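=== Given protein ===
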Amino acid sequence: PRYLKGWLEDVVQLSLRRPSVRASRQRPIISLNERILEFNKRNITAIIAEYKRKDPSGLDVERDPIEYAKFMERYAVGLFISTEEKYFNGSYETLRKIASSVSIPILMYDFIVKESQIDDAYNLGADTVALIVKILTERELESLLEYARSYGMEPLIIINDENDLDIALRIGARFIGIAARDWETGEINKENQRKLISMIPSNVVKVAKEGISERNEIEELRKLGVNAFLIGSSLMRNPEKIKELIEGSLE
């Protein structure tokens, strides 16, 4: 991994030691990026809903994850399931049970630093994974991306600054997440997020992460080329907020 400090250094070391699984996959691989493009063509707003028990920038929520996932099948273009143990309070078993219960695309969100974690994603039923430019060297990124593609997955490559965006394009990313949140401070900068979005080629499937809360914002970002929208904590607390984001409101 790259030179790191603080919590990211900690989580990378934890992830290096994550035990692999021998679960067996019992669903096909269905493309999240392709379903996003389908929604775009159908003029249906594409929201990727997150399941996460905890986020370092949020409070813990203890809800039934299966009940949540099945609700989101009605609305979401896919699910983003957080499996990191220490900071996201996650579990491989939660991913496995949700995957066993739904038919929409699932991204396993964790700090992927070794090939066995991609094996884990496949074996547990996730359709794809995220790779994080902040923590992986160019060489690791390219290797893990190639490895994931060998399973037939298309990873979401997550960036939050210009140099990391260049690296994402350099390594051959086709599916990019533009995060508004700073990894170190937790601060949100939407001006930066939009600047990055404006620099991405049209043929890349683009997902905005963080800072999305209103239909108006979503439509603004669609016009700027964003294809889909990751929305997590807001929905973890009030799932029905997704209705207005997709359908508009009477209110």
Q: What stands out?
A: The radius of gyration is 17 Å. The chain has one domain: 1-251. Residues 161 and 199 are 11 Å apart (CA to CA). The first helix runs from residue 6 to 16.
